[PDB]
Design a protein around this ligand. Structure first.
Ligand code: SF4
Ligand code: SF4
Ligand code: SF4
Ligand code: SF4
Ligand code: FES
Lengths: 166, 238, 127, 196, 384, 180
């Protein structure tokens, strides 16, 4: 009960879902400042179903884990993630997050994917905004199911069945 | 014991001893290439040349290491003239030393390299650097010569480390190498063609260049990268 | 000056011979070195007609009986040298304009070089 | 210059006076006499207590009197209606056994948090300080972290076929205590400086 | 009640957990609870080389990156006594001031965003892009830079740098004004800002505030004047000042700074000509790579430099500097290893935050948001 | 006060009718400068011979340790690089690459030269440790780009332009104001 299981429905609904992406950014790093950049002022995101750019999971289901983080943030983020609605996607934005760039330390959390499952990595710290665009284009066609892995291997149209959803 | 003053510090150190060692005990240092632990010196490197007062000053800089000690002696090492000279000898050494650093696998262990950068540098605050006075073509000689089922020899590495030839005399007292031609034409070789001595391989370590290397780990890793795990042998009851 | 070029061209030539002899006798050849100035060349003009700075003929033991080296591009005193191991024979090829490539002052020919080679090969015959 | 009436005093009280040729100066005090001394300074017209750097000299390639050492930076803001630009350090070697020291909350409310950090990072309890809590670190990790003894926390980086790098022996890096591959060093590699 | 404003909210993006003791219609006091991020850079950098540490320096200042970098650079440079070419030094100021402008752009950008009308941010951002484009040019990097190198920057300026630099100096004065234009009138601007942000100058020092907080209360305290470091001695420019601690004052200061900065640019361009871009002592400097081809000694030093990296002598060192964010400085103890034995960072904003329960005494509840924002938190200072 | 409020509107209104300044991606190529740092390329000579020798100087430079390099000694008859040492395995973990650039500076073969790439992002951890052959001057895109372009059968584009090449690159020709 989510818009699937007839030819029609699944493409329909999936187009709906795919094109309405509402980003909730989880700044805690330099990413954010590039993210405000990423919003406006050169390029738009409103043409990708985004007026949502702001802090409520009550407004979004696209999780952008944006920035290098610490131990103290893991349960927090976890919980924030939990307080989203049922279908939800996890972007792991940038190197700082994705595998912990140039820090090997107790303080930090390396490999953000630990805390929550991921579907999209987008390396580079900083990356270019545009890379993120490319990434969400990916994520678009990914949730559309018109994607694979680099071994031709298919995957679910959500991030949210890799570990438990709620 | 012998009353030594190296520059600013004094040490007792019993007689018959080398100036050199007292230098290092004193926390003063020099470039060093010929003589080595567990081995009788020679003068060959000529790196341990200092001046000494006892109080006058020698007219020729004696290899401190080779010379014995003396009570009431002054040793001068922070000499401006020393430093200049060090550089000098370095340059001289470098004259035919073939450029091969990236593929040099003496590398992090190129103590020679480290002395260069330690003690070297042109005599001139600079506003423009110098690098050389040399510019002629280098010697080209012997390389890629497998010396042994374990040891590759590329000859132009050698600085005329005489260490190994020396080793063979000192340590096993079994010899298999020799310098060949004279002067600059010289170079060390064997005529065993594979050295049937039961002790040989230590020369790899002794080689203060990368001439003698363990072929088995040639182009396999880099000096710094290794974890050098002090541990214990058991392969002989020693 | 541009002496350089003919020399280089000669160096190739000589090298070619070294290979020929190598195949001819079936004797072992090994390239020894390549130019520094090729390695560390990395966008600065390279135009050398080969890539090879040093190469040798070995007995078949990895021991050379003949070494053959060119001088590098901007390395002054541009000559090509030969030297026979354990012979103390050191040959200095000059180039002389209006002549060709000379061995001391006597022009080199392939046969000269072959003779040198055979006497080397056969005499020293370390293996 | 405000400094000078402190300096003659320091000399009078025989305190050793460190000086780098970079014109930075420390004053080596005992713990006891500090507070009051430092009281006198603010009174003498010391504007601004800039820093508190807690020092761990667990391992050092020279002897020091103590393992834990604090350093204050006091300044006189000349841009203020008082001050002379008089900036100088005070160093105070600290027994490891007692990681105590009376606060200087008393003379600047800046101190408060600064000393708090120093409890966290090095073990020091500053006497007369309201609140110790970490303000910067987990309280689920303990051992007053950021000390030489304290772990460095590495993880191998991973590459294809599980091929990995372990950082802490990867490094060609060193300390002065450390010798590396070389059997000795001197020259440049025992440091270097210029004057020219 | 004690209200718990948690991290990442709403778009203020301090890790901020804030215990607001309220009267249910007022703020009484805030016990700020922070430190939910942290790294321990200071630790890590003793486990990396000096060269390596230059990676870390812009990685704790989203804003003026180059200042951290510079400050660290200077410290090292002092220690081993290395000098920097004049042209280098020219470039260094240019980047610095360019970075200051950047910072200000972001400060006001966020200011608007945080609360008040949303839009003008985007315009300020347009300009920021222009700045970024300049950075992109010369360093190939949007931000974070390594262009500055020991002995001076590591390569020459683009020629392309000159047109564009003029260009933007043309546009900006007018632009700056038009941002200013939004503030000073708007009588609502008044009614949101003027009364709040209070703190005596005396207490600013006691609790530790740094310029553009201290100088936001009009107390003259440019560390570039007071402990004048390179080039600035010989550059005219004045101190922009307020005269009271409030938001209102802060905001106007910054605008004035920008204009000063621009004149410094202007000054700089005049003083710009060819020159080597880093110190030519190859002992202490990595050599030019157009010479590996040539000498062995080159090769040796080169190899060595980028592997081991030099040994500075034993020493502690500190230099005070004026960052965009205040009193900046590094207290660096080296033992003479290839890595330092202590890296202390003087983080201004962090010290400036100590003054928050104070700053926010007895305030009004919608006002309290702004009062945080006005002080400028970069969490890197705090968290470290 | 009141005047301003009007003036505010005034300017913005000007801007309203101003035809905007923003650039659509990927519909006009992003403007980059030649010093820009994208994905590292491994270069070669016109002798068709890879410059790199597995110099691994980079590896001391990489603070992230982002390089796994298995070295090897070239074939004497068929040397893959003219040198006597090459990089038998060249891996880069882009998930933490520092793209040091210092990297480039240490490498003496000038093998490593930052690209103009940024169109990299995929779903799987271990796919993002880019390999040797993905890191050349001979590929025609990013890994996902390429992998898409086969399954889709579509060609390529990369959506950037520079004023001109960086001199450092001297192989691959990128879109430069004259491509996209
Ligand atoms: S990847 Fe780079 S830009 Fe992103 S949070 Fe890390 S350091 Fe900042
Ligand atoms: S022997 Fe030493 S100086 Fe020579 S190439 Fe090898 S590492 Fe370099
Ligand atoms: S091979 Fe090595 S140890 Fe032997 S003489 Fe030469 S340089 Fe010295
Ligand atoms: S890319 Fe350059 S530095 Fe890296 S191994 Fe190859 S030649 Fe060496
Ligand atoms: S150690 Fe060489 S002359 Fe003495």
């Amino acid at each position: 009960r989510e818009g699937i299981l007839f030819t029609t429905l699944e493409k329909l609904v999936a187009w709906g879902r795919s094109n309405s992406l509402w980003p909730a950014t989880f700044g805690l790093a330099c990413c954010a400042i590039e993210m405000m950049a990423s919003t406006d002022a050169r390029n738009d995101l409103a043409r990708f179903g985004s007026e949502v750019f702001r802090a409520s999971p009550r407004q979004a289901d696209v999780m952008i884990v944006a920035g290098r983080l610490s131990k103290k943030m893991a349960p927090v983020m976890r919980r924030v993630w939990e307080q989203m609605p049922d279908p939800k996607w996890v972007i792991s934005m940038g190197a700082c997050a994705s595998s912990g760039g140039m820090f090997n330390n107790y303080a930090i959390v390396q490999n953000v994917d630990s805390v929550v499952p991921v579907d999209v990595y987008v390396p580079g710290c900083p990356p270019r905004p545009e890379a993120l665009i490319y990434a969400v284009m990916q994520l678009q066609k990914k949730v559309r199911g018109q994607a694979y892995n680099e071994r031709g291997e298919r995957l679910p149209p959500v991030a949210a069945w890799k570990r438990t959803r709620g | 014991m012998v009353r030594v003053k190296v520059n600013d510090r004094i040490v007792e150190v019993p007689p018959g001893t080398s100036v050199m060692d007292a230098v290092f005990h004193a926390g003063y240092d020099v470039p060093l290439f010929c003589s080595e632990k567990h081995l009788s010196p020679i003068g060959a490197c000529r790196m341990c040349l200092v001046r000494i007062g006892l109080i006058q000053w020698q007219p020729k800089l004696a290899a401190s290491c080779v010379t014995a000690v003396a009570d009431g002696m002054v040793v001068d090492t922070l000499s401006d003239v020393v430093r200049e000279a060090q550089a000098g000898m370095v340059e001289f050494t470098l004259l035919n030393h073939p450029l091969d650093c990236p593929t040099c696998d003496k590398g992090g262990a190129c103590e020679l390299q480290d002395r260069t950068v330690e003690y070297g540098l042109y005599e001139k605050p600079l506003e423009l650097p110098v690098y050389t006075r040399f510019e002629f073509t280098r010697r080209h000689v012997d390389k890629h010569h497998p010396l042994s089922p374990f040891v590759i020899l590329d000859r132009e590495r050698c600085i005329h480390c005489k260490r190994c030839v020396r080793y063979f005399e000192e340590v096993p007292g079994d010899e298999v190498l020799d310098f060949i031609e004279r002067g600059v034409h010289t170079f060390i070789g064997t005529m065993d063609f594979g050295l049937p001595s039961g002790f040989s391989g230590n020369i790899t370590d002794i080689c203060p260049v990368g001439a003698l290397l363990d072929l088995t780990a040639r182009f396999r890793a880099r000096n710094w990268e290794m974890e050098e795990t002090p541990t214990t042998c058991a392969l002989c009851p020693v | 000056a541009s002496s350089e070029r003919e020399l280089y061209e000669a160096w190739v030539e000589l090298l070619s011979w070294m290979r020929e002899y190598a195949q001819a006798k079936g004797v072992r050849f090994e390239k020894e070195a390549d130019f520094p100035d090729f390695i560390y060349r990395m966008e600065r003009p390279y135009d050398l007609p080969t890539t090879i700075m040093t190469a040798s003929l070995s007995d078949g033991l990895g021991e050379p009986f003949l070494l053959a080296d060119v001088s590098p591009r901007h390395a002054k005193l541009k000559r090509i040298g030969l030297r026979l191991p354990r012979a103390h024979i050191h040959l200095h090829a000059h180039y002389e304009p209006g002549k060709g490539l000379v061995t001391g002052k006597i022009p080199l020919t392939k046969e000269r070089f072959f003779a040198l080679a055979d006497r080397a090969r056969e005499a020293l015959a370390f293996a | 210059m405000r400094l000078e009436r402190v300096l003659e005093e320091a000399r009078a009280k025989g305190y050793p006076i460190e000086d780098n040729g970079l014109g930075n100066l420390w004053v080596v005090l005992p713990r006891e006499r500090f507070k009051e001394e430092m009281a006198h300074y603010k009174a003498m017209g010391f504007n601004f207590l800039a820093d508190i750097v807690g020092l761990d000299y667990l391992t050092y390639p020279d002897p020091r009197p103590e393992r834990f050492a604090v350093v204050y930076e006091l300044v006189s803001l000349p841009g203020w209606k008082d001050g002379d630009g008089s900036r100088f350090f005070v160093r105070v070697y600290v027994p490891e056994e007692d990681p105590r020291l009376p606060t200087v909350t008393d003379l600047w409310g800046s101190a408060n948090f600064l000393e708090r950090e120093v409890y966290d990072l090095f073990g020091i309890v500053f006497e007369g300080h309201p609140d110790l809590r970490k303000i910067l670190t987990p309280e689920d990790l303990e051992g007053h972290p950021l000390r030489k003894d304290y772990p460095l926390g590495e993880t191998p980086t991973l590459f294809r076929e599980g091929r990995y790098i372990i950082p802490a022996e990867f490094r060609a890096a060193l300390t002065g205590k450390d010798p590396g591959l070389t059997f000795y060093k001197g020259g440049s590699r025992k440091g270097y400086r210029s004057l020219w | 009640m004690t209200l718990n404003v948690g991290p990442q909210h709403p778009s203020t993006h301090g890790v901020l957990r804030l215990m607001v003791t309220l009267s249910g219609e007022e703020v009484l006091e805030v016990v700020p609870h922070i430190g939910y991020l942290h790294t321990g850079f200071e630790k890590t950098m003793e486990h990396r080389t000096y060269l390596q540490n230059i990676t870390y320096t812009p990685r704790m200042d989203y804003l003026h990156s180059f200042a951290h970098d510079l400050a660290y650079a200077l410290a090292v440079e002092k220690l081993l006594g290395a000098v920097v070419p004049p042209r280098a030094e020219t470039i260094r100021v240019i980047l610095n001031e360019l970075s200051r402008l950047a910072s200000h752009l972001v400060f006001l950008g966020t200011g608007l965003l945080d609360l008040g009308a949303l839009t003008p941010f985007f315009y300020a951002f347009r300009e920021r892009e222009t700045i970024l484009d300049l950075f992109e040019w010369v360093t190939g990097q949007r931000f974070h830079h390594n262009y500055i190198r020991i002995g001076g920057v590591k390569e020459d300026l683009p020629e392309e740098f000159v047109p564009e630099l003029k260009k933007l100096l043309e546009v900006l004065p007018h632009r700056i004004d038009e941002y200013e234009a939004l503030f000073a009138e708007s009588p609502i601007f008044y009614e949101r800002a003027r009364g709040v942000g209070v703190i005596p100058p005396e207490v600013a020092i006691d609790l530790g505030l740094t310029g553009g907080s201290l100088r936001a209360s009009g107390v003259n305290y440019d560390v570039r004047k007071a402990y004048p470091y390179s080039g600035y001695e010989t550059y005219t420019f004045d101190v922009p000042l307020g005269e009271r601690g409030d938001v209102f004052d802060r905001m106007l200061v910054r605008i004035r700074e920008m204009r000063e900065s621009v004149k410094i640019i202007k000054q700089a361009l005049e003083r710009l000509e060819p020159g080597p871009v880093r110190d030519p002592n190859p002992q202490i400097t990595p050599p030019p790579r157009h010479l590996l081809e040539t000498s062995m000694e080159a090769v040796i030093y080169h190899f060595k430099h980028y592997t081991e990296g030099f040994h500075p002598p034993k020493g502690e060192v500190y230099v005070p500097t004026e960052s965009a964010r205040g009193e900046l400085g590094y207290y660096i103890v080296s033992d003479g290893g290839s890595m330092p034995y202590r890296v202390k960072v003087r983080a201004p904003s962090f010290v400036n935050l100590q003054s928050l329960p104070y700053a926010c005494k007895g305030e009004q509840v919608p006002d309290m948001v702004a009062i945080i924002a006005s002080l400028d938190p970069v969490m890197g200072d705090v968290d470290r | 006060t009141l005047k301003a409020l009007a003036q505010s509107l005034g300017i913005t209104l000007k801007y309203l009718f101003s035809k905007p300044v923003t650039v659509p991606y990927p519909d006009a190529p992003v403007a980059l400068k030649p010093r820009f740092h994208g994905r590292h390329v491994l270069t070669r000579h016109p002798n068709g011979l890879e410059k790199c020798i597995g110099c691994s100087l980079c590896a001391a430079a990489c603070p992230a340790y982002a390089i796994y390099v298995e070295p090897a000694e070239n074939d004497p008859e068929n040397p893959v690089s003219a040198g006597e040492r090459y990089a038998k395995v060249y891996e880069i973990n882009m998930l933490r690459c520092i793209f040091c650039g210092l990297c480039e500076e240490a490498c003496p073969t000038g093998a490593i030269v930052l690209g103009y790439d940024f169109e990299m992002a995929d779903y799987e951890y271990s796919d993002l440790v880019y390999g040797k052959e993905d890191m050349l001057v001979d590929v025609v895109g990013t890994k996902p780009q390429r992998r898409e372009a086969k399954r889709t059968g579509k060609p390529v584009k990369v959506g950037y332009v520079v004023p001109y090449v960086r001199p450092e690159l001297e192989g691959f020709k990128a879109p430069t104001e004259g491509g996209k």
